Ligand binder design. Structure first.
Ligand code: HEM
Length: 110
C-alpha cells in the first residue's frame, strides 16, 4: 500500500520549510521541524491528514466540510495553492499518485 504516512510527513516538512508561519496555527507551534515526529500534537494532526487522503481516494471525503473548517482557522485559497505545490513534491518524492484533483476539490469551496 502507498505509504501515505511518509508522504504526509514530507508534505509537512515542505510546507513549513516554505511557510514557517503556517506552523503557528497548530498545536505544535514552535517545535523544530526535525522533532515533529516526536510531538504528540503533530502525530494526531498528521494522522488526520493521512485519513483525509485515504478518504479522498476512497470516495468519502467531504471537501466542502474540510474547506469550511480551514476558513474557520483563517486559512484560504492562497495557502491551499501553496499546499498543493508542497504535496505534489511529497508525492513525487515517494513515487505516489499526485493528489492535485483532491486539492482542487477543496479549492473549489475556497
Ligand atoms: C494538503 C492540504 C491540506 C490538507 C489535506 C489538510 C487537512 C487537514 C485536516 C484533515 C484537518 C483536521 C480537520 C478537522 O478539524 O476535522 C486539518 C486541520 C487544520 N489545518 Fe489543514 N490541511 C491542509 C492544508 C493546510 C494549510 C496550508 C494550513 C495553513 C496553516 C492548514 C491549517 C490547518 C489548521 C490550523 C488545522 C486545525 C488544527 C488543530 O485543530 O489544531 N492546513 N487540516
Amino acid at each position: 500500500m502507498v505509504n501515505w504516512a511518509a508522504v504526509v510527513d514530507d508534505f509537512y516538512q515542505e510546507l513549513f520549510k516554505a511557510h514557517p508561519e503556517y506552523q503557528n496555527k497548530f498545536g505544535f507551534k514552535g517545535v523544530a521541524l526535525g522533532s515533529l515526529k516526536g510531538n504528540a500534537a503533530y502525530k494526531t494532526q498528521a494522522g488526520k491528514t493521512v485519513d483525509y487522503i485515504n478518504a479522498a481516494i476512497g470516495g468519502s471525503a467531504d471537501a466542502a466540510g474540510l474547506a469550511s473548517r480551514h476558513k474557520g482557522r483563517n486559512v484560504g485559497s492562497a495557502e491551499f495553492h501553496n499546499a498543493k505545490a508542497c504535496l505534489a513534491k511529497a508525492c513525487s518524492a515517494h513515487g505516489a499518485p499526485d493528489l492535485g484533483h483532491a486539492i482542487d476539490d477543496i479549492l473549489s469551496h475556497l
